Design an enzyme around this catalytic site. Sequence first.
Site, short mmCIF file in Angstrom:
data_model
loop_
_atom_site.label_atom_id
_atom_site.label_comp_id
_atom_site.label_asym_id
_atom_site.label_seq_id
_atom_site.Cartn_x
_atom_site.Cartn_y
_atom_site.Cartn_z
N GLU A 1 0.80 -1.22 0.00
CA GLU A 1 0.00 0.00 0.00
C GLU A 1 0.84 1.27 0.00
OE1 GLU A 1 -0.58 -2.72 2.18
OE2 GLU A 1 -1.88 -3.33 0.52
N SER B 1 -6.72 5.47 9.72
CA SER B 1 -7.39 5.34 11.02
C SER B 1 -6.53 6.13 11.99
CB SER B 1 -7.48 3.87 11.45
OG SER B 1 -6.20 3.31 11.68
N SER C 1 0.39 8.75 9.91
CA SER C 1 1.81 8.48 9.74
C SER C 1 2.40 9.65 8.96
CB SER C 1 2.01 7.19 8.95
OG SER C 1 2.52 6.16 9.76
N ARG D 1 9.44 6.88 7.79
CA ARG D 1 8.43 7.41 8.70
C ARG D 1 9.17 8.17 9.79
NH1 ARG D 1 5.67 6.22 13.40
NH2 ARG D 1 3.39 6.42 13.36
#
Lengths: 333, 325
Positions: free
Chosen positions: B95, B149, B152, B164
């Site tokens: 993803e 949800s 990041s 990240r």
Amino acid sequence: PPFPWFGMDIGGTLVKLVYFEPKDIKSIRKYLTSNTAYGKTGIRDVHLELKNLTMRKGNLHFIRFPSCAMHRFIQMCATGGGAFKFEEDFRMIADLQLHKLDELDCLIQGLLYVDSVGFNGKPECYYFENPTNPELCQKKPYCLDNPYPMLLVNMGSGVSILAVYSKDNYKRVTGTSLGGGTFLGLCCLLTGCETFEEALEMAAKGDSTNVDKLVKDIYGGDYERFGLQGSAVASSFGNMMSKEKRDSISKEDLARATLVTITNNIGSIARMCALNENIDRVVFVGNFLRINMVSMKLLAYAMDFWSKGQLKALFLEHEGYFGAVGALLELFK
Amino acid sequence: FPWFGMDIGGTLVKLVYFEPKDLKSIRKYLTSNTAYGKTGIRDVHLELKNLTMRKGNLHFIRFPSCAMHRFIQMGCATGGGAFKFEEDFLHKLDELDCLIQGLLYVDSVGFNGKPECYYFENPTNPELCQKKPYCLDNPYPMLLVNMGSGVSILAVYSKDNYKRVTGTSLGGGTFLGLCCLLTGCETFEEALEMAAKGDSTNVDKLVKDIYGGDYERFGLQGSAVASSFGNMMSKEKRDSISKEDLARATLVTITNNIGSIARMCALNENIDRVVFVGNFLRINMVSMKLLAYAMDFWSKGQLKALFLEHEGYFGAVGALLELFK
């Protein structure tokens, strides 16, 4: 300056009074020293008493009582929001001569003064080792002899973070609107509770992992790619759009998740501020910490989490009485 | 040998199809209409023309995951709902990688002569709110705020190099979760619709509520929020709120916080270009404008929230690019 040296922090709820009792030189002096409780409401925290202090040698006492008994107090230098409200009574009944002082400057001055004189041979500052482990958790002393520079995270209804470089140089670096007021506000709406004490007691007993969606819930465990442990929270309240999940939660769980969400957020913000300001001592204060140690322990865990163990959440033994101490110090000016 | 990419993510499905210019059945049904079945759309405005990939047109289509079997019967993919339909089929892709590759690609080729990136001016003032294009020529380095949800934040240094930097658990799942508990709503769409009509100032305590106006000492304007949900411990104040106000206060709390986190991250990483993406920006523009306001607020007007025209399809595009590998 002339004797009975007092300092007062009159809040719209609780009143804090500090009194410097001269050692080795007046009916008021005997009343304070010969009593641990006053007017069936007031309380004198003997454990916070500072002995052999020189301001002349004497002892510094810390007393507290509801703002309700303020009328009785009058019958028998100040800061706080309740200072104005009772400015009338202080004059109508007894004698006013009330000098209103800024809350923030009193807090800072008092905090720095207490830290400078110490706590009877011990540090005024402390932190928590293994905060979220009931069996290993331990409050530990931390010598903060030179507090400059430091970051002060003041948590009231909202949160303000200040960089302190000297007694008179402290500026607000940033802040967040998600603070103690957010915790209580949401708790009231989510659980029907009404007070801070109730919400905090609830949070201390709850389990937030029932309401929050964890990293391990998405990846079955840690997600090494992002250096995220499976126990980390992926989404606060992230399980609550599921009826099945809601069926397993309790009001205590909701209170806990609310507190955890707020404390983890504050830790993240305070840690990033420390990094940007190049300061590595972060001290937390505020009424958000005065009723239940649960909040401090969660802040301790958050600071360690976000800093990867590099920064500790620091707290102060006399938290709550700094405004009063600051007021007292103004007398000598 | 047909060019297309798919993003099968739980509920909504994204499909990108490159129509060659100069298996022909698909070249018919697709061009023939803009709507497919009960729920199926083809965003014509997002269509990229005269694109060299041969040369053709890149189409963007979206439809519910339940209508996936339909799609299959009529006959590289990403998304957390790919291996389900793996039996009915499939090369599942990551993803995150698809999102980034697709995003960088679309920005590189542009949007038919116009920039793919844009920002807002006076985002919360509907009488002055104006969408402004932004030239994101060389995107390296840039910060990507991916809102799902949870949230990041990734630093993108090059097509093959990104990491990240941090994140926050207060995200879209928090908005919906709290809304479900506070208002009884059931879906993100319902929650967002309620939030668009509410007034969070009845729920939150503002700076002016404490100081009677601005608070110069802290450089805080009276309109700034002092405490999110800060009026709610008062019975009399709770008596004045509506479900719409609660939904809005929840959204404002989350977007303001994300803006602060993103701003501090930019500062710490010395990166001034911050792009926002994610299903959290799925429906209208309420969230996007709130984030725009937040970035301007926390950065004191020095940083703007950047958005992309084709947000939502980048994963599908990323999938497509994999075919040429």
